[PDB]
Amino acid sequence: DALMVMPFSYVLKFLKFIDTVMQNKTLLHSHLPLICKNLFFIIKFNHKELVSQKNEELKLQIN
Amino acid sequence: HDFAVTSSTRVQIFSSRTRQVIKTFSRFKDVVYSASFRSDGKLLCAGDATGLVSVYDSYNPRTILLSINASTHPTHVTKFHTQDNKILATASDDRVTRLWDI
């Protein structure tokens, strides 16, 4: 419910956050299940808006 | 084609066949100066020495549809525009012939 309240603008900051976590692989394995659940619902909830954008920097982050 | 006569403070509509009064409009406080119908014949407009112009539904004396105070001077002529229904012409002793809209 907390994450559904999030506007799509804060999703992009969330995706950037998750990307930065990726480099810290120590933090990655420590909380891998949680990162999976929260990241992936977020894609679910506002998939339509996320796919809409043409932003190159977002395209490399998702990859 | 019942015909309206303006007499004293009243307007009397007479049936063509019966040749007798079928409707009477006596709401007017002062002398009445006109009884012209609209083109559709549904509405009747009239003038008064007070200057107010009152619009009645023809054959329905009880109902008043629209009342306009054209001037404080007497209003002697009140005629609906034949081409256009909505606009009503009012001429008064004020020497200005106001063109009203319903």
Partner: protein, 229 residues
Amino acid sequence: QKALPASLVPQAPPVLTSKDKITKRMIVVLAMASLETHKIKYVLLNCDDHQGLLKKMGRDISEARPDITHQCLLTLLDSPINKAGKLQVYIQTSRGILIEVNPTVRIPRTFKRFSGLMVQLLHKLSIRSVNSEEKLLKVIKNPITDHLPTKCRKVTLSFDAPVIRVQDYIEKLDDDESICVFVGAMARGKDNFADEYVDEKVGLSNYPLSASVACSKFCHGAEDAWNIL
């Protein structure tokens, strides 16, 4: 050669009351009027006359001056705009009692006689004329919003707000509208009494203004603006 009106006899302008809302008007709202009664016989509590009694009540005697409310009505009621039938006055007691002031009334010029009315009005809730034809002072139901005109402009007298010209203000406003002015009868206090309901607050002069002075200044501009004379 525009023709003359048929009847040029002088005609008294209508007495404008709460039932009539369409007409353009100036409404002066004397917010936070310090008007309260208490049995000693009920007397209008005053800053000077009843100091010990108000101390027993626990209310500060600084905000216990119905004189200011009395003076504002005098200048407002005596203004030519009132004589032209274009101004109506409402009074909001600090306790939350709303009073409608009929423009036709003549409040006594002496304050003591005025206090005699206020206890009469607050207890009897209505005041009648000498000839018994019209109710001059009648307490009315809050909020103040419903009694005011349907389309109206709202301002408060704020010393902190930018200084404006009242004449230039009323001129730029529309005609079917009406102007409502919230004047604080308080000796001192924060100008947030009407903040809930008003849309903006304006300043009238850079120097501080008394309630009697400010409302008189505001109405004179309307007379100049509306050519009341």
